[PDB]
């Protein structure tokens, strides 16, 4: 009468990480479990009827580790299915960036990108995306007219971005996260659009 | 603990190939840059280059790009350099590194060294 | 490339008094974003591998004893050893670990004067 869990599938963004699942339970419930590669698994979600399980907390722990997941089923030897591998650090996706602020230094714009949060904690410091990343962390921008005759590009190693601008003419930017150096999951969603007289 | 356990030493003629190799245990592999760090006799430290086993992602110094290769095997916890043709000037320890947790926290590991000796 | 500048070159420290290694880089170091000086020492012992001492400018790395401290901001930094004892002989380098390519002092080598 229980039906084995199928299409494990991580859910990272940020580091917030949650595990999903087929199918919508009928008259049975979910145990979910982790382990790192090599040590010892430890339950999260116990006997729920929900498709999906927040396990952030463990990951927080160790960002640079492999995990592996699992749910058991149990009607309302015990059925299980393994989760695809999952290390935090390479394929959690990067969050929407946002632009702090754009302003307009002589004939150039300077263009700053805000340090986002993340949920990773030392301490009583809640890490930030260049906490965590360092220099893998790099940063692409889109940048057009009024009168748009193909959209321009730009990189920056750091959080700032110096272009050449034209007089009078009104500007809209878009910014973008990237680790150049990841296999999955190297770009970020675009920035909200911040235009020049906005 | 975490251990990086470089090959022995080695003895080569001016333009023979040579791979050196670096076995990474203690830790998951892939998520972290193995460095690779010259030292010539009675000298400083120079960073080589550096690699992402995850993805085989390599950055070189603009002085030894060109001169070497750096890569990995992941399945085995190993990377590795080499050389193409070796000049007596190459004859040097060899380090290989791994970086820390967080973002630009350093070489957090070294191995024991490779010492390569090119000579007639 | 950015140069990193070490004074001085050799360090004469008699057991149990402080000494102060200077690093000097060409650009600056600090990242704005999130207010950090990415500078990084090193101590390489007598017939030894090098190790880590101190990250972020003057962050510890864990089993690094208290005696070791980093300080300073964008291109001006400082390494102080408060009470130097004779396991702490060998050469110190600084590291740009800011921006690519990663850059070496020349190195400041402490021994104990006598």
């Known amino acids: 009468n229980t039906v084995a869990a199928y299409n494990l599938t991580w859910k990272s963004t940020n580091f917030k990480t949650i595990l999903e699942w087929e199918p919508k339970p009928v008259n049975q419930v979910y145990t979910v479990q982790i382990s790192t590669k090599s040590g010892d698994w430890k339950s999260k979600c116990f006997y729920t009827t929900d498709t999906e399980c927040d396990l952030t907390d463990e990951i927080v722990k160790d960002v640079k580790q492999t995990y592996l997941a699992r749910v058991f089923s149990y009607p309302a030897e015990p059925l299980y299915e393994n989760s695809p591998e999952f290390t935090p650090y390479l394929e959690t996706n990067l969050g929407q960036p946002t632009i702090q602020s754009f302003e307009q230094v002589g004939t150039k714009v300077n263009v700053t990108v805000e340090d986002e949060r993340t949920l990773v904690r030392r301490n009583n410091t809640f890490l930030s995306l260049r906490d965590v990343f360092g220099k893998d962390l790099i940063y692409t921008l889109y940048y057009w007219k009024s009168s748009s005759s193909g959209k321009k590009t730009a990189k920056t190693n750091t959080n700032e971005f110096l272009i050449d601008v034209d007089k009078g003419e009104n500007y809209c930017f878009s910014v973008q996260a990237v680790i150049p150096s990841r296999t999955v999951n190297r770009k970020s969603t675009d920035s909200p659009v911040e235009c020049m007289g906005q | 603990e975490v251990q990086l356990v470089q090959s022995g030493a080695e003895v080569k003629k001016p333009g023979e190939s040579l791979r050196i190799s670096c076995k990474g245990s203690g830790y998951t592999f892939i998520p972290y840059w193995i460095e690779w760090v010259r030292q010539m006799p009675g000298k400083g430290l120079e960073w080589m280059g550096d690699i992402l086993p995850g993805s085989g992602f390599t950055t070189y110094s603009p002085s030894f790009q060109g001169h070497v290769t750096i890569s990995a095997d992941k399945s085995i916890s190993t990377a590795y350099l080499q050389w193409s043709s070796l000049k007596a000037s190459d004859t040097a320890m060899y380090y290989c590194?791994?970086?820390?947790?967080?973002?630009?926290?350093?070489?957090?590991?070294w191995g024991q060294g490779t010492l390569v000796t090119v000579s007639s | 490339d950015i140069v990193m500048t070490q004074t001085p070159l050799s360090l004469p420290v008699t057991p149990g008094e402080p000494a102060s290694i200077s690093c000097k880089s060409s650009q600056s170091l600090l990242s704005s974003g999130n207010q950090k000086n990415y500078l990084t020492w090193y101590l390489q012992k007598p017939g030894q591998s090098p190790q880590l001492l101190i990250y972020?400018?003057?962050t510890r790395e864990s089993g690094v004893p208290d005696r070791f401290s980093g300080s300073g901001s964008g291109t001006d930094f400082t390494l102080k050893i408060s009470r130097v004892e004779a396991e702490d002989v060998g050469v110190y380098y600084c590291?740009?670990?800011?921006?690519?390519?990663?850059?070496f002092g020349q190195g400041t080598k402490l021994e104990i004067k006598r």
């Open positions: 590291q740009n670990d800011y921006t690519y390519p990663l850059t």
């Open positions: 972020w400018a003057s």
């Open positions: 590194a791994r970086s820390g947790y967080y973002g630009n926290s350093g070489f957090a590991y």
